[PDB]
Design an enzyme around this catalytic site. Structure first.
Site, mmCIF file in Angstrom:
data_model
loop_
_atom_site.group_PDB
_atom_site.id
_atom_site.type_symbol
_atom_site.label_atom_id
_atom_site.label_comp_id
_atom_site.label_asym_id
_atom_site.label_seq_id
_atom_site.Cartn_x
_atom_site.Cartn_y
_atom_site.Cartn_z
ATOM 1 N N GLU A 1 -40.725 26.266 92.246
ATOM 2 C CA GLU A 1 -41.456 27.516 92.041
ATOM 3 C C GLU A 1 -41.026 28.577 93.051
ATOM 4 O O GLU A 1 -40.977 29.763 92.719
ATOM 5 C CB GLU A 1 -42.952 27.252 92.162
ATOM 6 C CG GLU A 1 -43.283 25.763 92.208
ATOM 7 C CD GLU A 1 -43.680 25.234 90.871
ATOM 8 O OE1 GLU A 1 -43.956 24.026 90.768
ATOM 9 O OE2 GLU A 1 -43.727 26.037 89.917
ATOM 10 N N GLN B 1 -55.752 19.828 90.286
ATOM 11 C CA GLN B 1 -54.773 20.868 90.553
ATOM 12 C C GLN B 1 -55.371 22.267 90.629
ATOM 13 O O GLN B 1 -54.804 23.223 90.099
ATOM 14 C CB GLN B 1 -53.675 20.836 89.491
ATOM 15 C CG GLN B 1 -52.956 19.501 89.416
ATOM 16 C CD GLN B 1 -51.565 19.615 88.814
ATOM 17 O OE1 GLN B 1 -51.407 19.883 87.622
ATOM 18 N NE2 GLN B 1 -50.549 19.419 89.646
ATOM 19 N N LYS C 1 -56.808 28.117 81.820
ATOM 20 C CA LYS C 1 -56.298 27.436 80.640
ATOM 21 C C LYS C 1 -57.116 27.642 79.375
ATOM 22 O O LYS C 1 -56.550 27.799 78.288
ATOM 23 C CB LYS C 1 -56.152 25.939 80.916
ATOM 24 C CG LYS C 1 -55.603 25.127 79.742
ATOM 25 C CD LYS C 1 -54.875 23.887 80.231
ATOM 26 C CE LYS C 1 -54.271 23.082 79.087
ATOM 27 N NZ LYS C 1 -55.307 22.350 78.306
HETATM 28 C C1 LIG Z 1 -52.005 14.160 84.204
HETATM 29 O O1 LIG Z 1 -52.904 15.148 83.740
HETATM 30 C C2 LIG Z 1 -52.431 16.287 83.005
HETATM 31 N N1 LIG Z 1 -51.039 16.416 82.751
HETATM 32 C C3 LIG Z 1 -50.595 17.566 82.009
HETATM 33 C C4 LIG Z 1 -49.194 17.686 81.760
HETATM 34 N N2 LIG Z 1 -51.511 18.559 81.537
HETATM 35 C C5 LIG Z 1 -52.913 18.375 81.827
HETATM 36 N N3 LIG Z 1 -53.818 19.288 81.404
HETATM 37 C C6 LIG Z 1 -55.154 19.216 81.618
HETATM 38 O O2 LIG Z 1 -55.806 18.335 82.221
HETATM 39 N N4 LIG Z 1 -55.742 20.321 81.076
HETATM 40 S S1 LIG Z 1 -57.384 20.584 81.182
HETATM 41 O O3 LIG Z 1 -57.106 21.996 80.949
HETATM 42 O O4 LIG Z 1 -58.336 19.917 80.340
HETATM 43 C C7 LIG Z 1 -57.714 20.716 82.913
HETATM 44 C C8 LIG Z 1 -58.982 20.071 83.236
HETATM 45 C C9 LIG Z 1 -59.471 20.043 84.645
HETATM 46 C C10 LIG Z 1 -58.655 20.683 85.723
HETATM 47 C C11 LIG Z 1 -57.415 21.307 85.391
HETATM 48 C C12 LIG Z 1 -56.923 21.342 84.018
HETATM 49 CL CL1 LIG Z 1 -55.434 22.114 83.740
HETATM 50 N N5 LIG Z 1 -53.315 17.230 82.558
#
Ligand SMILES: COc1nc(C)nc(NC(=O)NS(=O)(=O)c2ccccc2Cl)n1
Ligand SMILES: Cc1cc2nc3c(=O)[nH]c(=O)nc-3n(C[C@H](O)[C@H](O)[C@H](O)COP(=O)(O)OP(=O)(O)OC[C@H]3O[C@@H](n4cnc5c(N)ncnc54)[C@H](O)[C@@H]3O)c2cc1C
Ligand SMILES: Cc1cc2nc3c(=O)[nH]c(=O)nc-3n(C[C@H](O)[C@H](O)[C@H](O)COP(=O)(O)OP(=O)(O)OC[C@H]3O[C@@H](n4cnc5c(N)ncnc54)[C@H](O)[C@@H]3O)c2cc1C
Ligand SMILES: Cc1cc2nc3c(=O)[nH]c(=O)nc-3n(C[C@H](O)[C@H](O)[C@H](O)COP(=O)(O)OP(=O)(O)OC[C@H]3O[C@@H](n4cnc5c(N)ncnc54)[C@H](O)[C@@H]3O)c2cc1C
Ligand SMILES: COc1nc(C)nc(NC(=O)NS(=O)(=O)c2ccccc2Cl)n1
Ligand SMILES: COc1nc(C)nc(NC(=O)NS(=O)(=O)c2ccccc2Cl)n1
Ligand SMILES: [Mg+2]
Ligand SMILES: [Mg+2]
Ligand SMILES: [Mg+2]
Lengths: 582, 582, 582
Positions: free
Chosen positions: B59, B122, B171
């Site tokens: 990044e 994250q 997201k």
């Molecule tokens: C390993 O977990 C994982 N890997 C990828 C590639 N994408 C996602 N996405 C995800 O968890 N999306 S979510 O929007 O439901 C989300 C929920 C809680 C916190 C952050 C996110 Cl992005 N996960």
């Protein structure tokens, strides 16, 4: 007891005071990359004979190394960087340390005090930038405060819920001559008064009571148990309660044990998630009910009494509301409950054999599994082999993604501080630097970085560090030419529509790119590649037997998928147990 | 005029709206590294046919590439990253863009809105982290705002004093279906009303008046003149005033001109600093009186009337208090003064020949110089050769340190946006990624990254990017096995006491480490090494003539020192003109 | 259903939209003081026929009136002020509302948007100033957002833990013509998802279980029960558990009941504090374990199982760590437990008669008491008389200090929202304005402000408001010529060394100063003075019987001390039960 290098009345530079402040804290290793604003500190460092510096090739390498050091030893990790670009380069490390509760003390040089706020050369309001991503930070405004601030930083970083603490030191203060006072008291009245007291017997006995009243108990252990290995072990042999672990808690309880349910969560074993799903008593020790583990909160352990023991009150009732809570050191709570359990043993007659069997049938019908295609190397198998050949005694650091999940699923950690992985922030490029820190902290240990080709390349420059520091770091690189986890999601929820997830060269779709062997060669590190599952054992064995650093490039078919899998925000009934990218 | 890919009444994902928002802004290239929180955006990106994505390997590589793109084209640079670790990895780039006033729009994915503040997977409070290191930032809380926010970001990033603007996109908003409204008005009442108006003729004529009244005038041009090449040129041929440039202003006025005094400041030419030291009229156009240029403010241009023209009122009178000021676009001020100068020409009869000669004698007694030892390659000479062989028409990006100073001193830039270097933050590892962006923005241009062995290795992973994107990036690596600038300071102010400034392997003190040629080979990039000054021309010529990417490892003796040099906070009388590490 | 005053397609000023936004929320009364930045809003207000404005004489009067209105009705209080001085004058009210969790919506005018941040006429960064003292605040940047923001403010102010919400409205937005959209959805994803769900039967039954297992249970009720009068009542007649109340919870459970232990804490009854001190089960419903109630946390309810039910998770485990917790609406928890208690009644056979008697002996050996000297009027007696003559059906608002404690100790509140007192911030001058709001909210109620001479004078200007609005506000002024509570502390811990606590005139030490009767006369409010205990009943009766506003100046000997008293940070064993300033 402590022998300084300066007369008790001899004035010395603030830089020298800062270094002695470190020696007085027991520091022996720091990861520092020199820069203008921190030159004085580096000069002072060379005057020290008890502290060694491991010069990284990138400040981010420095922080991640510091984390590795901390995560594998139990002591705080120390990294030093110059002002501006030096400081901003630690940000990911700090955020990482805060989310995973890793004790860390970062020191950064700053422009001279009078120039602060003037957009000076290499100036960055680091204290302002890092306030939300550190447990606490400081801006030293007087050489007189160096002793006190350093003591406070280490205290704050290591006490309660461990975390990172940054200390900003203006260059003019580094040069200011002064006579330090090591007797000064810390100014943490609020924090001190907030520190949890030893757990009360009333609370602990209520818990032991809930246990005897339950028929389907389940231990949900996390990163908070990293220093309660023995206590937890004894607790389990006195209760016979099955143990489910989080990604951060791996190793707290030996994965190679019949009572072990292994990891739970998004990519946890079907039986671990099952146990929690149908438990009537959830003992959450040292965990934070993360979305990765719970999925849909309302569905998580919906049929059971939740007992939550945490050192951070802010965590108790944050996502899941407990029936019973205890704000304190889980280690002490365990020692407390263990006594109660040992005495009132006969009158308790705890026996969850029926529950354990209900789970053991699940453990048998839905075990961790992987498919072998022709002679292609199954990453799961490679990790399984590394385990066998190292007899599960290796310190394992990893990158983020599929390889990370497999390293978690197919290696049985005997003890805590053996698993070094970025769980909360999930920062790529963590594996190699972390291994570096772990190796320095554990010179006689087998240190293996199970990396991904994407994660590995981000901080590949640290290979230079490994060579020059002559660290026996082994790199088990699971090369799949892709950004695995993102690819898996593309396959599952985007009709396999690839969007910048391929890491190889499109001009030569079939050629392995880049050639990681040459990155190794560039830094004089012996390396080799493996493609056939048949040559895997000998290859790994070689990596292990070859003295010094070693890089084993393990080619794997990219269509592999981590299983099982519970989609984000899902329920146990949404668990996916089959399929891949083929 | 703009042809969308969706019906004016057809609802689409916020991700798709964000991408169209970009296309409507004229964006054609973005540097994005996929991650969970930004997957939707990447998917939307593949549906675009007008925007190409250059997938970096880190990044930070992405941001620096975006800066390169912006700095070499005049348009804003766009980088995209996922949440948490993705986002924190842009920090140095943002800080860099803010300090150098580089138009940039960074977009980061965020966790779903409802999870913000819960320490989610994250998650990082990036908006909070980056507030002090960006011109402005946003947290999109509704898909409805995507169009407006994107328009505002580009507007803010490119208008007034250019700078970085970050846009945080949860997201769940990326997935929300909606019908965009591109007619919405921006909400920047305060900013709009603050935008400088065209300069007044009263102010401009007073300046032309001060010029005719002065006997020792000196132009002090900076990064603010990057779009006034022609205007400045005309201004000089109408006034005959000698031109001194800052590190950020190089190329505004051709370095290969008799009226040129070249760069001033800490490592500026003796005559440029002389001119300013003894000037009676200092015309500061598009500069910020940085400590690197002024040294001790009280001594800087102490004997002259200071006219300061800046687009940012906050800069006028920040470090130096002007006698005359003009808050506006220097380009317009120049066009204005040029007219006045053309008309009242005959009655003005401007002639500073006496001053110019006083300076030309200085230019002759104290010119830029370097020493040649045996057959050792003088870095200054190498850069001088590159200039000749490229006929000074190459876009040059660099790292930070001595090589950077030499690239600035010994290459004559004909035009602005040819010099891509990190001046304010001075971030190492900027050179290679920046070159990548510059190449994409200028496909038919000769792009050469004059790097240092320390700076080059920090983002060496971007070599992969260069190959896969088939960019004709040339790397003139001045290899001195050390952290040059810090080493120079060790020699000058620390009795040459080395403190972690050596980058090679102590076990083999004489072997060049690492072997940069192998890093190149790993990414299938042709490379070669040069050690003898005699083989230099042919080597460079080869690098230039060989189609595609190329890495030339130029070995240089490390004891070289950048000269002249005015120690930090010093005066013109403190200038050092001799000596080195020998 | 709602009939607007503008055509659904007719554009109108943002000011008019804001007012309709209020009418649509059910607002009927607002306390607004006109100023330049809010003129438009006031003009719009006169066009409304459903909203009446009560013009205070000081913005602080306005806020406190709004609080009174809210605290006595259960609906949100609305106050409006102009920019700068208008806005800063609400600060104490906002802080007060936040600490006592009083639903309140404050609206302030702001300078035109483009002038924000320019130190404009009457400009104050109120949003910045009030962020830490409001539940949430906003700066409207577009007339389009008025509807949504207003809806969100009321929602946030009234939902969950009630609190103040400020809305900053730039003047130019008040004048902007637009067509409002009342269908817009609120942007509170995080908040909504955090809202507690109805309590689970598992949790509630565990509680009922703990009750049956306890022998010395004690209810610790607070401000959170203000809307659970009936539920709590039923709960007590099903459990027979003694009830201790906080200063904010007075009236939740009738003080005139044998099961009532009255108020606990620093100035609580000896038996209430006793009960808690020796309880084995503490049911903390709608309380926040304040230092005023707990004293030394470690000693507070040290021998019992603590069950804490709160609507704010941040409060559960903040100062005291519970054994059992429930994050939700106590009203629902009570309804839930009541059912369980009604059914499993026979099998529970709850009987705490032994405990109740242990307490009733304490209630008899250590009751609330006061001494009568000659014919001097005992403040306690006066309040006791007011109770009798009003039959405890009066809405009582007070100031802060001794009179406040006595108003709490000697008046038996039958229902909640009858006691209006500043508990958390403890702001003086609250009593009179609060009474004003309470009267407007309850036109047919007996409203009596039991004030102190110090507190009363701070906002004495509101007497004007009372007259002009023809509010039947009665003022029972307990005049002791001193700052009572501070004086008491001087006597107890500073050897009675007076330090600016005397409010009369030293020149005439014996003359009552000022003459509050004349302040009343100035605003045409009938008043009278009383000095002899014999004339007290007739005097109070007159005050009550005289139609309209009335001020009764009750002279009291200043040496009176509030008892009992547990010094700050003390234990039940440190309780003081005797002595005074004599
Ligand atoms: C390993 O977990 C994982 N890997 C990828 C590639 N994408 C996602 N996405 C995800 O968890 N999306 S979510 O929007 O439901 C989300 C929920 C809680 C916190 C952050 C996110 Cl992005 N996960
Ligand atoms: C690609 C990817 C996939 C993932 N998949 C999974 C998965 O499927 N399953 C999973 O479990 N995780 C997974 N994670 C990791 C996940 O993000 C969280 O980091 C992890 O679940 C956090 O676990 P934890 O709460 O147990 O530990 P921590 O995050 O370390 O939290 C520990 C808690 O313990 C408390 N505590 C600390 N010290 C003490 C003490 N001495 N006494 C008492 N309490 C203490 C803390 O204050 C805190 O509340 C994944 C991460 C990535 C990058
Ligand atoms: C190792 C190292 C050594 C260095 N040594 C030197 C040295 O010796 N000499 C030197 O010069 N620098 C040196 N620097 C660079 C230095 O740090 C500063 O970045 C540089 O001096 C800033 O120059 P500037 O003010 O001209 O440009 P900028 O920093 O780009 O500032 C430009 C200014 O112009 C204004 N402006 C922008 N657009 C317009 C417009 N359209 N119209 C009017 N005004 C406008 C801005 O708002 C601002 O105030 C060094 C850096 C490093 C890393
Ligand atoms: C001079 C002076 C002396 C004082 N002396 C005393 C004294 O001796 N004794 C004493 O008690 N106080 C005293 N106080 C008052 C004291 O400062 C605190 O204001 C009071 O103790 C707070 O009580 P509380 O926690 O019950 O109510 P609040 O402060 O109103 O707190 C209520 C709590 O209930 C929760 N809650 C709200 N709504 C709901 C719902 N629907 N369902 C569930 N939970 C809900 C809240 O979020 C919060 O945690 C004194 C103040 C002054 C000015
Ligand atoms: C190229 O400038 C440079 N290089 C090194 C290796 N060190 C420094 N130090 C320096 O300038 N120090 S200073 O403290 O006087 C300072 C002044 C203003 C802003 C920052 C700093 Cl560190 N410079
Ligand atoms: C004495 O100035 C004055 N008096 C009243 C009663 N109203 C106003 N209003 C005013 O100036 N309005 S304005 O919106 O144009 C304004 C401009 C700058 C700063 C604040 C405000 Cl309110 N003025
Ligand atoms: Mg991969
Ligand atoms: Mg170098
Ligand atoms: Mg008084």
């Amino acid at each position: 007891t402590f022998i300084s290098r300066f007369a008790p009345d001899q004035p010395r530079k603030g830089a020298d005071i800062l270094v002695e402040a470190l020696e007085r804290q027991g520091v022996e290793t720091v990861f520092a990359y020199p820069g203008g604003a921190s030159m004085e500190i580096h000069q002072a460092l060379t005057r020290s004979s008890s502290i060694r510096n491991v010069l990284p090739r990138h400040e981010q390498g420095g922080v991640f190394a510091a984390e590795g050091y901390a995560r594998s030893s139990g002591k705080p990790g120390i990294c030093i960087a110059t002002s501006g670009p030096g400081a901003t380069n630690l940000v990911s490390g700090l955020a990482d340390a805060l989310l995973d509760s890793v004790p860390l003390v970062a020191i950064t040089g700053q422009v001279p005090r009078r120039m602060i706020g003037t957009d000076a050369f290499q100036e960055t309001p680091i204290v302002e930038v890092t306030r939300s991503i550190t447990k606490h930070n400081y801006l030293v405004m007087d050489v007189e405060d160096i002793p006190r601030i350093i003591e406070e930083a280490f205290f704050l970083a290591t006490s309660g819920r461990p975390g990172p603490v940054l200390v900003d030191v203006p260059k003019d203060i580094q040069q200011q001559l002064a006579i330090p006072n090591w007797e000064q008291a810390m100014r943490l009245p609020g924090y001190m008064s907030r520190m949890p007291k030893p757990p009360e017997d009333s609370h602990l006995e209520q818990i032991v009571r809930l246990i005897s009243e339950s028929k389907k108990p389940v231990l949900y252990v996390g990163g908070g148990c990293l220093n309660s290995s023995d206590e937890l072990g004894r607790f389990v042999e006195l209760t016979g309660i099955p143990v489910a672990s989080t990604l951060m808690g791996l190793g707290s309880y030996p994965c190679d044990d019949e009572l072990s349910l292994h990891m739970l969560g998004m990519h946890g074993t079907v039986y671990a998630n099952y146990a929690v799903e149908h438990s009537d008593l959830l003992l959450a020790f040292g965990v934070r009910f993360d979305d990765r583990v719970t999925g849909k909160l309302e569905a998580f352990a919906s049929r059971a009494k939740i007992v939550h023991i945490d050192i951070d009150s802010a965590e108790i009732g944050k996502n899941k509301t407990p029936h019973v809570s205890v704000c304190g050191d889980v280690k002490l709570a365990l020692q407390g409950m263990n006594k109660v359990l040992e005495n009132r043993a006969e009158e308790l007659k705890l026996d969850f054999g029926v529950w354990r069997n209900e789970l053991n049938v699940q453990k048998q019908k839905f075990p961790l599994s992987f498919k072998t295609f022709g002679e292609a190397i199954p990453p799961q198998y490679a990790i399984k082999v590394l385990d066998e050949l190292t007899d599960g005694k290796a310190i394992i650091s990893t990158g983020v993604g599929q390889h990370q999940m497999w390293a978690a699923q197919f290696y049985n950690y005997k003890k805590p501080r053996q698993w070094l992985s970025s769980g909360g922030l999930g920062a790529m490029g963590f594996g190699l630097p972390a291994a570096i820190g772990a190796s320095v902290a554990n010179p006689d240990a087998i240190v293996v970085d199970i990396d991904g080709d994407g994660s590995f390349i981000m901080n590949v420059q640290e290979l230079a560090t490994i060579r020059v520091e002559n660290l026996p770091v082994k790199v088990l690189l699971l090369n799949n030419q892709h950004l695995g986890m993102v690819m898996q999601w593309e396959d599952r929820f985007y009709k396999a529509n690839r969007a910048h997830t391929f890491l190889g060269d499109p001009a030569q779709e079939d050629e392995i790119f880049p050639n990681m062997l040459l990155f190794a060669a560039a830094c004089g590190i012996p390396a080799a590649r493996v493609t056939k599952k048949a040559d895997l054992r000998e290859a790994i064995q070689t990596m292990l037997d070859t003295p010094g650093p070693y890089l084993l490039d393990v080619i794997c078919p990219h269509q592999e998928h981590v299983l099982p899998m519970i989609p984000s925000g899902g329920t146990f009934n949404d668990v996916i147990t089959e399929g891949d990218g083929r």
